Structures are given as C-alpha cells and as structure tokens.
C-alpha cells in the first residue's frame, strides 16, 4: 500500500463518517457493509473485539459489554453532571479511576476498563481502516470534528484518541464550521456573513451561530438539547400504534419486547418514507397473540404526534440568537445538518421562522460535517 | 387465475427468506445436539459450557428477529394471495422456532 491523502472524520456520538477530497470532489467512504456512516460502537465478547456495524448488530445479545456514547464521556471528570446523568441510561458500567471515568466490561473472560479516549481510538482505527480499504493506500493525516461547545479537556482527549489510533491529527475543527465549509459559505462575496447551523442528528440537537469575515470563523453562540433526535420521534409513532392496537383488539402489546421491537423497526422505516411521501403503510403478520397488524399513517398525523418536539426546536434557535445579540433577519445562511433535518415539518418551521429564506440542504445531512472536514484536510496537508 | 409477473418478484424475496430461515433452523438443531452432548458428557466446566450455549441461542434468536424485520418491510396487495399466504406461513414458522429458542433459554443458565 502506497501513501494516501488526508481524510476528514466526523466522530459522532452514535455514528461516525469519513470522507476524502480527490479528483476535485469529496467522496464519502462506504464501510465494509457498504454503509456511508458507521456506528460509534465497540463490543467486547468471549473471543473478539468488534467495532462499528459488527458491534451494533450484537447489542441485543451482549448489552453489558457493548459500549457506545463514548463521546458523551470523553474529556470529562467522573463527577461531571453529564457523566452522572448519562450513565443512568447505559446498560454497560462506568467506573471511577482517580476522578476519571472508565468503561468497565468483560473482555476475553476478564474484567477490563478503558478510558473514553481509548474507546474513541478504536472507532477512529475503524474509520482509518475504512479509508485505507477504499483508497488502497495508507492513511495517516486526518482532521477530526468536535461540537463547538467542547472545552480544552474534551478537545485534547479527542486528539489523544486520534494519536492512540495512529493518526496524525492535523486539526480539531468545530462541527458547525465543517458544515459551513462544505457549503463554501466562507468563499462568498461580501464583508461579513452570519451563519446559523441547525444540527439535529445522532441523538443530540445543536444550534450554533458563527460569523465569517475573510474566511475566518468566530463561534458567536451555541444552544440545543443533548438528548433529542429520531428515536424520540419514533417513540411517538410507537405509542400511536400501541394505542391503535388497544382500540382495535383490546390487547396491550407493550410488555412483549419482540412485538414492540417489530413495531419500532417498522416505525423507523415509516418515518423515512414520510420524508418523501405523504403516507406510509405497515403490514406486520402475527404481531401479538397471532393478530396481524396492517395499518398506515399520514405525514399530517406523524407531524401532529410530534408537534411539540418539532416546534420546540425553534426555542434553542431563539436562545442562540439572544446570546449572539442578533435579530433573526441578520442571519445570512442557514445550514441543515443531521438525519432528522430531512423531516419536511422541521424544514417548514425553520423556513417560516426565517421569513421564507432558502435553506442549505443539498449535501447529505448525515455527511455534511465529514464533507467539510475532508475539504479542510486537503488544505491542511 | 390472475397470477402476475410482479408477484414473482415478491415470491422470490420470500423464497430467499425461507432459505435463510432453514440455515438458522439448522444452527438451532446443532445447538440442540451440543446441549444433549453437555448434559450427558462428564461442575464449573458444565456451567461455562451451558452459558457458552447461551451466547449461541441468543445469536440464533437475534438472527430469527432480523428475519422477521426483513419480512415486515413487505407490502403485499390483497390480490397477491399466494405471496400473503407464503409470508403468513414463514412468520408462523419463525415464531415456532423462537418458542423453541425460549425453551432452551428456560433450561440453561438457571438457579
Ligand atoms: C428519508 N430519511 N432518510 C434517512 N436516512 C434518515 C435519518 N433520519 C431521518 N429522518 C427523516 N427522514 C429520513 C431520515
């Protein structure tokens, strides 16, 4: 394998993405399972260590030893309010080693503990091997993204994850900065551009306001919800169907985990259909107690079930404009980032809030950060 | 007798799923033979061997669940009677294999 170019890596809470700039364009790299995004999951089994798709696929089988959300722990102290509140949800153990958090698992029939940067390094190693398999060349140089609100300890910890993974980390750039770079908002004519980045993806919601002057970025404000995404929207459609099944059959499918999962999986797929169609149908045979569940949902009902969650996205936007000391009319560009920005209602509410202004949404929302990080990596090296 | 070429496409998908189900059913049968092997084949080693079978049954249950999820992506118009019948029978076959998987779980890693 010969010397390869520099790559852009978006290290996400639930999914990571790697891109490369070559032949005058960014190509988002598909992993070994043909997926352009890879789960930020690490599994520890009786015989092997699994990363990405392989780790996410056995989560049901091995819940305690399948680590995810290492991004929520990286660079934090054990007694951080975020570490104490987030560990409530996690099925794996989070221990304390001299004020630092460590994930405690069962690996090769032995109790082992790893720092969050050691877990992220394994994910980063996977992103590096994905790039090397596609280019057929060795990959050393990389730009890695972090949320704008990340402190010094969180930023250094991510750099350490890249160093442990064997990467030469060119720069740690902000996710909203990377999204803005992807759309070439820094190469537009004028004196000063105010950019709002709306990021609704991978379990979190982040709104950032940035100012661009002669291609230089300044983070004006950040606002959002660290626990908001597609799963919450999915939950609302799951409750809707469970209620529908009670009305039609007088049976509660809620305590049967397999029945709930089959319905949840169908709902996650129906939500995707509702981004391009106005109705989605579901046909589930022998769902519960041998009863077949054939039904549909319109985009309007889906929007109604999530009305509060969708309208609620605007509040963080208001908070960010307040901190940045800007009116909504002062915003030059709006950037949509994250898989849930594909939802027409979210797009409608954000265009209606900014008085019919056009949105920057042509680049795949799940890939925009990796796209800009790849652009940045081709410049840095 | 209004069989359409469009239905052939749906039947083909179901046939592939049936082949995947038989592969998972064979793994369940082998698991059963191994189980019989442990229970009558000469302490702490037995427990490790049964809870190693536990990981394997859990893997088998997960493969059957992922098959159901693939079956649940199908939309079969009412006139696709043959496809609806085949989908219904395959779901019932998988569900009977899951009930057998659950019986193995009810007998291993117990106190
Ligand atoms: C169509 N589509 N495709 C997606 N891959 C996706 C992730 N989250 C989403 N929310 C709404 N619509 C989506 C998605």
Numbering used by the authors:
A (entry chain A): 1 to 381
B (entry chain B): 149 to 190, 193 to 261
Quote the study on this structure.
To probe the contribution of the tricyclic core, we synthesised the tricyclic triciribine fragment 3 lacking the ribose group. The 3-bound HSC70-NBD/BAG1 structure showed the same overall binding mode and confirmed the presence of the hydrogen bond with Ser275. The difference in affinity between 3 and 2, between adenine and adenosine, and between 8-aminoadenine and 8-aminoadenosine illustrates the importance of the ribose group in nucleotide binding. In addition, we found an intriguing difference between the HSC70-NBD conformations of the adenine/adenosine, 8-aminoadenine/8-aminoadenosine and triciribine fragment/triciribine structural pairs. In the three structures with the ligands without the ribose, the phosphate-binding loop 2, which protrudes from the IIA NBD-subdomain and is one of two phosphate-binding loops characteristic for the actin ATPase family, adopts a distorted β-hairpin conformation similar to that in the nucleotide-free HSC70-NBD/BAG1 structure.
The 70 kDa heat shock proteins (HSP70s) are an abundant family of ATP-dependent molecular chaperones, involved in many cellular processes including protein folding, prevention of protein aggregation, modulation of protein complexes, and protein transport between cellular compartments. HSP70s bind to extended hydrophobic sequences in newly synthesised and partially folded proteins, in a manner dependent on a cycle of ATP hydrolysis and ADP/ATP exchange. The two main cytosolic HSP70s are the ubiquitously expressed HSC70 (HSPA8), and the stress-induced HSP72 (HSPA1A)3.
